[PDB]
Amino acid sequence: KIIFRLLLNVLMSIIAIISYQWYEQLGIHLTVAPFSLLGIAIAIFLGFRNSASYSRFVEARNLWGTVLIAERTLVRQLRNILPAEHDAHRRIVSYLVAFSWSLKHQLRKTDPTADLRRLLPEERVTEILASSMPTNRILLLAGNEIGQLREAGKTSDITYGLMDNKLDELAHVLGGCERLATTPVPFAYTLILQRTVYLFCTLLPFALVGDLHYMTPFVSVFISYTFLSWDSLAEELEDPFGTAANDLPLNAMCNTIERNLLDMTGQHP
Amino acid sequence: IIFRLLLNVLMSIIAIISYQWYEQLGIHLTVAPFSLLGIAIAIFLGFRNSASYSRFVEARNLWGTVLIAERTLVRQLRNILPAEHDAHRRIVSYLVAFSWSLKHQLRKTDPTADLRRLLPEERVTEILASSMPTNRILLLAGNEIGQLREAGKTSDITYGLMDNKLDELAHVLGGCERLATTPVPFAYTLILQRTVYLFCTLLPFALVGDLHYMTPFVSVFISYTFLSWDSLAEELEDPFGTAANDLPLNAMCNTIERNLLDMTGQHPLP
Amino acid sequence: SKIIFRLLLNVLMSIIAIISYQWYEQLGIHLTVAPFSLLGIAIAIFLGFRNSASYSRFVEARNLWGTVLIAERTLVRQLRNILPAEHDAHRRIVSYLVAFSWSLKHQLRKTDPTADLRRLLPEERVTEILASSMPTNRILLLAGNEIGQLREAGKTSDITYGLMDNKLDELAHVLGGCERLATTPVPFAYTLILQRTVYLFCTLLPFALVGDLHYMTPFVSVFISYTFLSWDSLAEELEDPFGTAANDLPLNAMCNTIERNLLDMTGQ
Amino acid sequence: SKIIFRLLLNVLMSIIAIISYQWYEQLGIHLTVAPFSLLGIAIAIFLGFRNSASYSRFVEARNLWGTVLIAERTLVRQLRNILPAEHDAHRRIVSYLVAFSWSLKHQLRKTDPTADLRRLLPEERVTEILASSMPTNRILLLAGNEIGQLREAGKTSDITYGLMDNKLDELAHVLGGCERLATTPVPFAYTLILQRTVYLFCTLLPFALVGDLHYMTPFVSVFISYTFLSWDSLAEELEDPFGTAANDLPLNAMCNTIERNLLDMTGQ
Amino acid sequence: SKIIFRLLLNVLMSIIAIISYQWYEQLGIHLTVAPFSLLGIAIAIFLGFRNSASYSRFVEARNLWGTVLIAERTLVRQLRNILPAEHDAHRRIVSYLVAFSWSLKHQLRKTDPTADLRRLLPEERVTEILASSMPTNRILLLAGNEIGQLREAGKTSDITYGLMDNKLDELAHVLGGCERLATTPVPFAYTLILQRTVYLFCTLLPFALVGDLHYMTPFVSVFISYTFLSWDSLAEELEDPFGTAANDLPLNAMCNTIERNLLDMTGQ
Ligand SMILES: [Zn+2]
Ligand SMILES: [Zn+2]
Ligand SMILES: [Zn+2]
Ligand SMILES: [Zn+2]
Ligand SMILES: [Zn+2]
Ligand SMILES: [Zn+2]
Ligand SMILES: [Zn+2]
Ligand SMILES: [Zn+2]
Ligand SMILES: [Zn+2]
Ligand SMILES: [Zn+2]
Ligand SMILES: [Zn+2]
Ligand SMILES: [Zn+2]
Ligand SMILES: [Zn+2]
Ligand SMILES: [Zn+2]
Ligand SMILES: [Zn+2]
């Protein structure tokens, strides 16, 4: 990965050293002052870009953090307002749990058919999978469970609207996660930075060899490691729903959500 | 942008063959002053690009709310009034019409073809007669919500629940209008774009003393780094502007229309 | 602006440094570029963060006025969908909302709102507004009465009353925001430090450049000075958003768009 | 200024640097500008972030105080709109809201609230307020009882009670926000050591600049010193917006505006 | 912290660079200052952004605990204004709220919350709370049962039940926030990369500075090392706001202030 290019940068230094003997046999000079200017501007641009990536990562963590909050209070409101409708308690929790797993499959571009059948009846699974957005359909079914208790006079419009806002909050999370996934800036994330940091890292030893007869690979790999490590960190934080090392553990976050919702409805795993 | 890189290579070749006659005229160009100028320009480019990225992000959040507000409004209709299927299809029309009309407004394109597809020509003429057609569609959508209230089909509580979604839409409309007008740097972005253009063309004359024949290669690498970062802030400053990328705006209006058709049992086929 | 004046004074400083270049080593005064690159970089950093504060504040002023259009649009829409038979109460409330916009413009510009208020309101209400030490705030209080009368007359439930009252709370957050922006600018210490250092650094620059540049001193010292001055002047023209300059907010055109919007919704 | 003493103390070090430059090679002390350019730019970067964080505390503090004027403006308006006859209730609540502002100012300034409290409230309540742990929270609870007494008396429905109740919640969020900015500043390691670093870099710069600028050392080294020192001491001021510095918030003027607003003539 | 040991190692790395500068020619190692300025400045830029992210994380944790005090204050105030007679619910709800604060404290600190919980609640509720793997969430559910009973008993309307329910929603968002901060830290690649690069840069620097500074190497080197290491440790000590150091949030002091505030609003 990054060590593979760190090794290549060492070979370019070796190329720049053994070919430094034939430098004067050509009209080439490479001072370090121009590469200090270029390198500093790249560092500034990497500093701002890396900052924008971390902002996405925090927003993704926050959006998933709201899933746990909204689904907790929706179950809490269901208990305090309607403590005797335990049938709706189980059915709504199964929709809320399915919403979390289906959102994970949505952001991961995987098949939710396994987790859907585990939690919901088959007639519901076919209705949910047949939608252009199954997570949106799950919120609709959860709203029908809330809304059917309203038609039965079991809850007022006020206490209905109280629970409605929780579904409204989940919808904002779904729209927010959908936004973060389908929002890549144009190819400037690679056209500008992926090329330049690479091209600057491999051309740097050819300019550093004039000052340092043999210390070039040490200094060049140190600068190349500093720049490449900062740039590669930005790529990981840019896509927080992937399977990288520094990406959101979505499977663990969904297990915590199902554990919470079952702990509130008196069910032991 | 490639044209200005060929101009830069041509200026480097000029600075090489002309490097003879600088002697004794007293015209010496070092690298330290141009290194100070370049680092300063890079700082301003970084701050400018930061404000541009923020405008691009706010544009995404506004259109994201369009998808959210229209989904929850249709969901509230099915959960509260599951039997009023005629009111369903009417309100779904205006919400889909609101999305396309808003896109055509930001892109200064004609919304007539999209409006005729979704709404009857009586309402299409009323919408196209108003100077603010996107606001007119919101008013018509409210008249459907208000008619369900006067008909005694919705309480004042549930009317307020749906009314809040039209408020989320109206906040988006005004937000996109505020972004659509030319931004806060009143034609001052043309100065910083030319400051970069002049710095990249005066650079090979400063570098040729230290680099000689390596000037066309190092000067074009620096010019490309500066010209690419500037042109990026140009694309971000104008998310709805002329000659922008219509893919995400078209995909969003298509996504919401598909969603609402699915939520109203219209899309799958019998 | 005066930016083109200080560019010419910078040209004169380049000429002084070019011809006085001789007596430097005699008096012992040398000026290299290296310490000026340190100072010029720290000034560019501080210039960047300062312009960031000026940018964010100009955006906030644009956001506030954008809310006036939104809240008045929806408050009129709600009156239509809820009380379509009350056409008389429509025009009474729309006139107050239009007056609120114009009075907020005249307040932020310190101009006379008496002319616009008499165009939209009866003289009894104009006297009531202009008698208050905070006339714009009194306009909201009168708009709250038209909403309140509809509630006490039984034509509006407390629920739908609360839906309309919230729009007046949005207008109340705009009034306080504009007042806060108008009385609290970016601290003077920022514009005091940078104005001094940028100007002193631009004039001393040809002295520290002539040793390396010679006859290229004027064509480079101006280029560098034009970069710092244009950036410092960008904040000069972004710190007065409520004014009447070319780069200020078009509050007159904004107040016209609002009055044009609210009359399109009420069929006038 | 707080810098005017340290600026002159730096000019003394520049004289110590110029007299002892030929004696560098006799004592074996070569000094260049390149290392101090690295150290200076790193401090300028850290100063830019530090100063930016301090201005954020200033903006939030000004915004928190702006909400007080907005929330108390509308709370009086809703009383005047929903219960236009309860002028005795209007008066009692307006006095509590004005006492809330002066009490919060004295809380953030650590001054005595007994003065402004007796100016606005009966003595039976000045004792109940001064005897509480948090007196500002005590004023809010008394303002809440007035809204609650109107509700238990049937004069106010649960819907219009919640409208006014939310305005007091907005005031409680301002109290918690000001307590936050006050009772926990920036970490002291920020200000403690960053002050050390800028001073030492300013008083060692002429020893490294004298070689390049043999006699221009005092000027260029005080120009750089003024730039770095004016930025640090300004960030030091903005960290404490509720303080009494020159660039802090005018809390006494703001409380005057709130009072002049609410008791405009009678009941706003 | 342990920064003093890293400075003395740098003083040893400088004398090793001085006693070994002779064999630079024989071993064929050249080291100029120009590349170490590009590296150091880039390290400084990344340090400035990283330190900036750590400060905002500390501030978010500070704001979360600020919301606890605000929400618990207004929930007690709303009870005294809506149900001034129902004191059986006053004492139970206040005890549940104070238990929420202490449970959250021990949760972020990973300490035993039994002592504080039994000091506030009966055993049949202390056992149920500690029997759950989410004890702090269970305290909110029990607090909801109190508000829910008052509504079912006909003592509050659904409107007033909704007004109080939105305070438990506010407390639920704080719990999710603190958990999200405690579990999900600043991505470890920041401390991974920057600590490697800063430490290696401070040891290699005297070998590049000794060619220009000679015997002045240890002073300028340990100065630059002190600046970089202090800024790096400052970001490290801001990344853990729920720690036990004096540098972190005084969670014990905040929970004492909350328990005093709620017991004061109920006259205890
Ligand atoms: Zn919530
Ligand atoms: Zn149950
Ligand atoms: Zn919504
Ligand atoms: Zn239908
Ligand atoms: Zn479809
Ligand atoms: Zn609104
Ligand atoms: Zn009408
Ligand atoms: Zn102006
Ligand atoms: Zn408000
Ligand atoms: Zn009154
Ligand atoms: Zn001398
Ligand atoms: Zn609150
Ligand atoms: Zn009590
Ligand atoms: Zn009892
Ligand atoms: Zn134990």
Please state, in angstroms and rounded to a whole number, the distance separating the CA atoms of residues D80 and E21: 84
CA distances for A42 relative to A192, A194, B224, D40, D80, angstroms: 10, 11, 12, 20, 60
Please state, in angstroms and rounded to a whole number, the distance separating the CA atoms of residues C146 and C138: 13
Q: Ligand 3 mean position to A48 CA, how many Å? A: 32
The residue in chain E having the minimum alpha-carbon distance to the alpha carbon of residue A231 is E46
Query: Nearest bound ligand to CA C83?
Result: 7
Domain extent at residue A154: 1-269
Number of Cβ atoms within 10 Å of the Cβ of C54:
21
Q: Ligand 11 mean position to E158 CA, how many Å? A: 85
- Bridge partner residues of D253 (DSSP): none
Contacts of D19 (CB under 8 A, 6+ apart): none
Query: Nearest bound ligand to CA D210?
Result: 11
> What 3-state DSSP class applies to A222?
helix
Number of Cβ atoms within 10 Å of the Cβ of D19:
9
Please state, in angstroms and rounded to a whole number, the distance separating the CA atoms of residues D155 and D146: 12
Q: Which of C29, C162, C180 sits opposite D163 (nearest CB)?
A: C162
Tokens of D178: 């000001």
Please state, in angstroms and rounded to a whole number, the distance separating the CA atoms of residues A204 and A211: 12
**Which runs of consecutive H residues, i.e. helices, occur in chain A?**
2-18, 33-81, 86-108, 113-119, 122-129, 134-151, 157-181, 188-191, 193-208, 216-238, 250-264
Tokens of D261: 């607003």
Distance of CA A248 to the CA centre of its chain: 6
Distance of CA B208 to the CA centre of its chain: 41
Torsion over CA: E242, E246, E247, E251 (sign) = positive
Contacts of A86 (CB under 8 A, 6+ apart): A265
φ, ψ at A102 (rounded to 5°):
-65, -30
Tokens of A53: 């990536």
How far off is chain D from C148, nearest CA to CA, in Å?
Answer: 6
Task: Give the DSSP letter string of chain B.
Answer: -HHHHHHHHHHHHHHHHGGGTTTTTTB---SHHHHHHHHHHHHHHHHHHHHHHHHHHHHHHHHHHHHHHHHHHHHHHHHH-TT-HHHHHHHHHHHHHHHHHHHHHHTT---HHHHHHHS-HHHHHHHHHSS-HHHHHHHHHHHHHHHHHHTTSS-HHHHHHHHHHHHHHHHHHHHHHHHHS--SSTTTHHHHHHHHHHHHHHHHHHHHHHHBTTHHHHHHHHHHHHHHHHHHHHHHH-SSSTT---HHHHHHHHHHHHHHHHHTT-SS--
Number of Cβ atoms within 10 Å of the Cβ of A59:
16
> What 3-state DSSP class applies to D216?
coil
Q: Ligand 14 mean position to E150 CA, how many Å? A: 14
From the list E204, E221, E230, the residue with the least C-alpha distance to E44 is E230
Count of alpha carbons within 13 angstroms of residue D147, beta-carbon side: 34
Q: Which of B44, B170, B184 sits opposite C73 (nearest CB)?
A: B170
Contacts of B244 in chain A (CB under 8 A): none
Task: Give the DSSP letter string of B155-184.
Answer: -HHHHHHHHHHHHHHHHHHHHHHHHHS--S
Query: In the block, which residue shows the tokens 């680099």?
Result: B211
Please state, in angstroms and rounded to a whole number, the distance separating the CA atoms of residues C159 and C84: 17
- Conformation bin of residue E214: beta by default, left when phi > 0, alpha when psi is -120 to 50: left
From the list D47, E180, B57, the residue with the least C-alpha distance to A51 is B57
Query: Nearest bound ligand to CA B81?
Result: 4
Please state, in angstroms and rounded to a whole number, the distance separating the CA atoms of residues E137 and C7: 66
The residue in chain B having the minimum alpha-carbon distance to the alpha carbon of residue A166 is B72
From the list A170, A163, A143, the residue with the least C-alpha distance to E165 is A163
Please state, in angstroms and rounded to a whole number, the distance separating the CA atoms of residues C118 and C123: 6
Contacts of A207 in chain E (CB under 8 A): none
φ, ψ at C214 (rounded to 5°):
60, -125
The answer to whether the CB atoms of E180 and A61 lie below 8 A apart is yes
Given a contact cutoff of 8 angstroms between Cβ atoms, the answer to whether E262 and E72 are in contact is yes
The answer to whether the CB atoms of D70 and C173 lie below 8 A apart is yes
- Bridge partner residues of C214 (DSSP): B27
How far off is chain A from B167, nearest CA to CA, in Å?
Answer: 14
Given a contact cutoff of 8 angstroms between Cβ atoms, the answer to whether C176 and D70 are in contact is yes
Contacts of D237 in chain C (CB under 8 A): 189
Instruction: Please tell me the total number of residues recorded for chain B in this structure.
Output: 270
Please state, in angstroms and rounded to a whole number, the distance separating the CA atoms of residues D13 and D34: 20
Please state, in angstroms and rounded to a whole number, the distance separating the CA atoms of residues A227 and E42: 8
Query: Nearest bound ligand to CA C86?
Result: 7
The answer to whether the CB atoms of C169 and D74 lie below 8 A apart is yes
CA distances for A120 relative to A117, A124, A256, B126, D126, angstroms: 5, 6, 19, 47, 62
CA distances for A119 relative to A99, A122, A130, A166, A253, angstroms: 10, 9, 17, 21, 17
φ, ψ at A28 (rounded to 5°):
-115, 135
Given a contact cutoff of 8 angstroms between Cβ atoms, the answer to whether E162 and A74 are in contact is no
Counting the structural domains of chain B, the total is 1
- Conformation bin of residue B265: beta by default, left when phi > 0, alpha when psi is -120 to 50: left
From the list C59, C52, C85, the residue with the least C-alpha distance to C235 is C52
Number of Cβ atoms within 10 Å of the Cβ of D268:
21
Given a contact cutoff of 8 angstroms between Cβ atoms, the answer to whether B96 and B257 are in contact is yes
Number of Cβ atoms within 10 Å of the Cβ of A248:
19
Q: Which of E42, E158, E168 sits opposite A43 (nearest CB)?
A: E42
Please state, in angstroms and rounded to a whole number, the distance separating the CA atoms of residues D24 and D207: 10
**Which runs of consecutive H residues, i.e. helices, occur in D83-132?**
87-109, 114-118, 123-130
Q: Ligand 1 mean position to C160 CA, how many Å? A: 24
- Conformation bin of residue E248: beta by default, left when phi > 0, alpha when psi is -120 to 50: beta
Instruction: Please tell me the total number of residues recorded for chain C in this structure.
Output: 268
How far off is chain D from C127, nearest CA to CA, in Å?
Answer: 14
Which residues have C-beta under 5 Å from ligand 13, the single-atom ion?
E 87, 90, 266
Torsion of CA A254, A258, A260, A266, to 10 degrees: -170
E interface test, pick of A215, A247, A261, A267 with most E CB neighbours within 10 Å: A215
Please state, in angstroms and rounded to a whole number, the distance separating the CA atoms of residues A228 and A221: 10
Instruction: Please tell me the total number of residues recorded for chain E in this structure.
Output: 268
From the list C56, A50, A36, the residue with the least C-alpha distance to B46 is A50
The answer to whether the CB atoms of A213 and E30 lie below 8 A apart is yes
The answer to whether the CB atoms of B79 and A146 lie below 8 A apart is yes
∠A64-E245-D107 over CA atoms, to 5°? 85
Please state, in angstroms and rounded to a whole number, the distance separating the CA atoms of residues A76 and C38: 60
Please state, in angstroms and rounded to a whole number, the distance separating the CA atoms of residues A203 and A191: 18
SS (H, E, C) chain C: CCHHHHHHHHHHHHHHHHHCCCCHHHHCCCCCCHHHHHHHHHHHHHHHHHHHHHHHHHHHHHHHHHHHHHHHHHHHHHHHHHCCCCHHHHHHHHHHHHHHHHHHHHHHHCCCCHHHHHHHCCHHHHHHHHHCCCHHHHHHHHHHHHHHHHHHCCCCCHHHHHHHHHHHHHHHHHHHHHHHHHHCCCCHHHHHHHHHHHHHHHHHHHHHHHHHHECCHHHHHHHHHHHHHHHHHHHHCCCCCCCCCCCCCCHHHHHHHHHHHHHHHCCC
Please state, in angstroms and rounded to a whole number, the distance separating the CA atoms of residues C129 and C117: 9
Any CB–CB contact under 8 A between E128 and chain D? no
The residue in chain A having the minimum alpha-carbon distance to the alpha carbon of residue E138 is A264
Q: Which of C52, C78, C264 sits opposite B132 (nearest CB)?
A: C264
Tokens of C220: 């480079």
Amino acid identity, position E231: W
Given a contact cutoff of 8 angstroms between Cβ atoms, the answer to whether B24 and B134 are in contact is no
Contacts of E201 in chain A (CB under 8 A): 222
In this complex, the chains that touch A, judged by 3 or more CB pairs closer than 8 A, are B, E
Q: Ligand 12 mean position to E163 CA, how many Å? A: 10
Count residue pairs from D and E with Cβ separation < 8 A.
140
In this complex, the chains that touch E, judged by 3 or more CB pairs closer than 8 A, are A, D
Contacts of B164 (CB under 8 A, 6+ apart): none
Please state, in angstroms and rounded to a whole number, the distance separating the CA atoms of residues C63 and B54: 14
**Buried-exposed string B107-142: b where 16+ CB fall within 10 A, e elsewhere:** beeebeebbeebbeeebbeebbeeebbbbbbbbbbb
How far off is chain B from C81, nearest CA to CA, in Å?
Answer: 5
**Buried-exposed string E38-48: b where 16+ CB fall within 10 A, e elsewhere:** bbbbbbbbbbb
The answer to whether the CB atoms of C70 and B192 lie below 8 A apart is no
Given a contact cutoff of 8 angstroms between Cβ atoms, the answer to whether B144 and B90 are in contact is yes
> What 3-state DSSP class applies to A65?
helix
From the list C230, C216, C256, the residue with the least C-alpha distance to C102 is C256
Count of alpha carbons within 13 angstroms of residue B162, beta-carbon side: 28
Given a contact cutoff of 8 angstroms between Cβ atoms, the answer to whether D141 and E77 are in contact is yes
Burial class from Cβ neighbours inside 10 Å (0-12, 13-18, 19+) for residue B197 reads middle
- Which chain C residues in 180-239 lie under 8 Å from chain D, judged by CB atoms? 180, 184, 187-190, 193, 197, 200-201, 204
Contacts of E213 in chain D (CB under 8 A): 30-32, 35
Q: Which of C36, C49, C227 sits opposite B41 (nearest CB)?
A: C227
Q: Ligand 4 mean position to B114 CA, how many Å? A: 22
Contacts of C164 in chain D (CB under 8 A): none
Please state, in angstroms and rounded to a whole number, the distance separating the CA atoms of residues D120 and D96: 8
CA distances for A85 relative to A82, A143, D220, angstroms: 6, 15, 80
From the list E144, E259, C250, C173, the residue with the least C-alpha distance to B184 is C250
From the list C265, C264, C251, C266, the residue with the least C-alpha distance to C66 is C251
The answer to whether the CB atoms of E187 and A236 lie below 8 A apart is yes
Torsion of CA B79, B80, B86, B87, to 10 degrees: -120
Given a contact cutoff of 8 angstroms between Cβ atoms, the answer to whether D136 and D100 are in contact is yes
Query: In the block, which residue shows the tokens 């930061």?
Result: B50
Note the resolution in Å, 1 decimal: 3.1
Given a contact cutoff of 8 angstroms between Cβ atoms, the answer to whether B141 and B98 are in contact is yes
DSSP label at residue A28? B
The answer to whether the CB atoms of A29 and B232 lie below 8 A apart is no
- Bridge partner residues of B212 (DSSP): A28
- Bridge partner residues of B27 (DSSP): C214
**Which runs of consecutive H residues, i.e. helices, occur in A152-249?**
157-181, 188-191, 193-208, 216-238
The answer to whether the CB atoms of D220 and C31 lie below 8 A apart is yes
Any CB–CB contact under 8 A between E41 and chain A? yes
Count of alpha carbons within 13 angstroms of residue E192, beta-carbon side: 10
Host H or E run for residue E162: helix E158-183
- Which chain A residues in 48-107 lie under 8 Å from chain B, judged by CB atoms? 48, 52
- Conformation bin of residue E154: beta by default, left when phi > 0, alpha when psi is -120 to 50: left
Please state, in angstroms and rounded to a whole number, the distance separating the CA atoms of residues C43 and C51: 12
Torsion of CA C63, C69, C74, C75, to 10 degrees: 110
Burial class from Cβ neighbours inside 10 Å (0-12, 13-18, 19+) for residue C201 reads buried
Please state, in angstroms and rounded to a whole number, the distance separating the CA atoms of residues B206 and B31: 6
DSSP label at residue D24? H
- Bridge partner residues of A28 (DSSP): B212
Contacts of D179 (CB under 8 A, 6+ apart): D107, E66, E69
Please state, in angstroms and rounded to a whole number, the distance separating the CA atoms of residues B195 and B44: 11
Given a contact cutoff of 8 angstroms between Cβ atoms, the answer to whether B56 and C239 are in contact is no
Amino acid identity, position C242: F
Q: Ligand 6 mean position to C172 CA, how many Å? A: 12
Torsion over CA: C192, C196, C197, C198 (sign) = positive
Count of alpha carbons within 13 angstroms of residue B75, beta-carbon side: 26
